[model samples]
Target: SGLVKMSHPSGDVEACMVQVTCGSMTLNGLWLDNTVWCPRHVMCPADQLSDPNYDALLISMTNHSFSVQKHIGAPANLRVVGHAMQGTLLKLTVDVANPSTPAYTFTTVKPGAAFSVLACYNGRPTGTFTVVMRPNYTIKGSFLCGSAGSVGYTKEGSVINFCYMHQMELANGTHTGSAFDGTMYGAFMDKQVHQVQLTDKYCSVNVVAWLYAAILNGCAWFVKPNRTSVVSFNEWALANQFTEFVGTQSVDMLAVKTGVAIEQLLYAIQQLYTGFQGKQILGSTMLEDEFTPEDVNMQIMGVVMQ
Candidate 1:
């Protein structure tokens, strides 16, 4: 993708804008500030701008890059039908330059095979387009546990189990150890419930733990259920917790603990927070009630680091 400069002139004020274009494709809604200028002329040949069959266009910016594949094309005399092994059937139509030509239909039956229509006039091949047939495999389930409930016990054969419902609220800026109680309590309660079920099956009574310790603290825990990872807010509470701790303890302790300068750590944390606050401020505008269309575009430019 090439960046171009666009100029807009008013009676007294002149503005220069930057635009991004990929080959023959012109990107819309791209804004350029005064720092960059949009291109005045086409960067590539018009003939070459025509998308090739299955061509992937790579778009790059300062922070990230992505590729877009040309999947749809126009051709004549070709009809495509696609059917998934367990899903819906799709049909694709083609338009031929000549009306008298006979239409040809193509189909695929392989388990994972894709159906596409390709055009070949006389002996020259034009392009290929895909039929939109795919399978549906969405799963939905609801959890029995919510914010709070009762803890029950179950017994199985030789084991006693207990289960409990628990909810915990942590303060905005707290550590992980203080937030561990809710998860521990929940796990222990669940085990007891499992034991109770097992004992009923084996004809036994399971004893439940009546006494539990609750640690009420202020901290946010980021829980990843799919990956089974829990991150306590304290882990990322600050940019440099270890170095700050050592520095606060004693200068000699700080030197002995990290063998690094405290100023460097402070500077790094300052930069980290600066960038973090920038993102937060820019992100807030997306939800602002007073944002206009121009304001939104300017906010986008700000987020792009202009």
Candidate 2:
């Protein structure tokens, strides 16, 4: 048998373009060209291109790839920035900017509290941003009298009415009080004998009053630790004759022991007042005549009425 002869056809040349899109950017293909050139198509029997050469040519022809280099425009002008965490009391810090007017504002948001952020451009409001805040903690407590001694009459049938004052010096070494402001007064009446006991407790009350005042003044020291100090509550009682009937009772109500500051004492006083509000005690009229429900709350927060 003679040598077998085989024939194959040449592949066609082709060109193509590819388009691709990535994220916010897009890429467009320009062009791709594949041309196979040979000298007079000379082969063994027919003008057939080799399989490997044809594959390489086709791959080179249509292998037009493109990628997005960059996004053309600037980012959106409107942006939300400056994020912060706020406590349960609705305390937050936020800073926002407006590029158009070139204005910026820093504000705090608090629940049950008024939000006042003044937006001014040359001392006028160009724009206003409202801050909506929600409280994370709810405060609940009572307002009542503190822990003072009994209010009953003396055993000798001698009518003894006393107005008392208390002072708490915080760890921060600051103090505040109302007893020294001449606003606290007391009157006693012995109705059994049809006699009116009219006198001011100011002089007698000075010791305790000053104690609390000193605490208020010394509040700066109470919030810190490793400080040494003593807080005293002095009690003075007098008779209707305007005579110093009883000696002053000076007691070191709070002494800064280890790991306790004056402010912690004040906090304790606040907690005690909160725990005592609307709760009755035997022979205790301290809060009954001196403080209102609201006033008691203020007292707990270490606020003194002048």
Candidate 3:
């Protein structure tokens, strides 16, 4: 087969054909050492090079034949590009809207959760997905579609495709709320951590920083590894004037309110925190991962949300 397959960070494979197609980029991978090295930018004209910004498309390839030759020039027209993995894995699509703006669409099949998608574009929610189920347990819809945006699933799954947009730092907006704006994210910890350390059962500053950042950024999700300790809860309660409360007592309250036990509540909080750090929680329980039911079925095209 002339096709070469490579793993993507999003748990999907990228297949590149040996006979390269013109106007598409390709990378040469050494089969022996399993090392792939490619230049970030190919030479361009002095006028173009004078501008410090260069954008290059990455096409996946493996050694078995020669790689595609580098061709650089301004094109007469823009083109639509797409990628996909086999069924129930991934598909990513893009159509150019303008030189600076492009429309992106992604699809994949996996377990669903309370919030199936968590998207951030330029520091705001990327809006909800219009999910549809086929005959049964099938999902199809547009996701991660926009310019200067980034996306991640609330549950563990594959990333069908990702377009590295121009303003990548904007993706980090979850932490700071906005790029080149105020200091809410940094200032949140100044007094909180200092006082947290003043307490007896102080979680390490590094550890507290991680949790605080995750909470502030709204990425905290369900987790199972780290259990919420009673000692820590009491301190929180004491600070908040819940003097008569014990930590476990509130756990019961949350258990009833959230309809989950202490274990699950802690799991959710940790999951949320981990996601804030841009990490997925592995080894989580099925119930924890499935925040909602998944079996449902749909097919609709040209769906637009205002």
Candidate 4:
């Protein structure tokens, strides 16, 4: 079959139409299933995604044969230029050309969270979707649709179809106010907090920074073991704070992203640090305080905040 199926981040296969028609952006997996802060994307160009400034949502490819080739909220015109993984992964790409600004205004939901996704061609109405995205979707829509080979149109427009793959409960509601509830995200936005160079390490950001250090230095104790009455392992852990922060793998990746002329890996901690702040500002949890739901969800994907 020319069509391969798309699945949620979980291994479960997506319930889609018998034929994979490009009905709406969501079907193509180009909608904002998750979000990134608007300002983080303002200065950075899409081509410079490797640069530290190139902070944005980069989702992992699912079992399905498609991948979105554009950043979220990019309102550019998508012409059917060229695509790969056509049959391999149902890959998609585009030329998103709209200079729309993010309003920053948001709504709240108690049991569910509100997310935003951009529609390329007008299929769905220009507003929030009605039903919560289901693992099995009800895709009944029609419009002027096409491929590089041909474009088709209905005599009139029809219902738009969409879905959010990230629909799973995060955790028990018992510790709502206990775990970092709003502290980590709150720290950055506070005006009184001193803003330092992005590369400089902050004491409160260790929970995040250590993650990057750990990711880069795959081996434990990348130094001589010196634990005794003279110095403690606690002291060793403290000392390695900024020491092993950057390494060959992490440095190489960021170097190619930012260019070796300047340092890149030095800010992995800060990157993770500020990245959490970005989510805090958006707060997909539908809760005003900390990133319980969203943070936990992102953690499942192997990070604190996406």
| lDDT of candidates 1 onward, in order | 0.19, 0.20, 0.25, 0.23
User: Candidate 4 — what's its lDDT?
Assistant: 0.23
- Off by more than 4 A, model 4: 1-77, 85-91, 96-98, 101-122, 126-306
* lDDT top scorer: 3
Q: List runs of model 3 lying over 4 Å from the truth.
A: 1-306
Task: Supply candidate 1's per-residue lDDT for 217.
Answer: 14
Ranking by lDDT: 3, 4, 2, 1
Q: Is candidate 1 or candidate 2 better by lDDT?
A: 2
Candidate 1 Cα lDDT to native: 0.19
Q: Which should have the higher lDDT, number 2 or number 3?
A: 3
Instruction: Report the number of clashing residue pairs per model.
Output: 26, 30, 17, 9
Residue 258 lDDT (model 3): 33
By TM-score, rank the candidates, best first: 3, 4, 2, 1
Q: Which structure is stronger by TM-score: 2 or 3?
A: 3
Q: What is the lDDT, from 0 to 100, of the residue 77 in candidate 3?
A: 24
Per-residue CA lDDT of model 3 for 51-127, tens digit only, reads 42322222341121223221222222222244322211112222322232222233332222112222333223333
Query: Tens digit of lDDT per residue, candidate 4, span 1-306?
Result: 011111112101111111122312232232212221111111223354244222222232222322223322322333433333311123333333223321222222222221222212222222222121111111111212211111111111222222121111112211010001112111122122233312211221222222323333341221122222212322432544322222234333323322321122233322433354333222121112111122222332333233
Q: Which ten residues in a row have the lowest lDDT in candidate 3?
A: 292-301
- Between prediction 1 and prediction 3, the one with superior TM-score is 3
lDDT of 2 by residue, 70-104 (tens): 11222211111221111100011112121221111
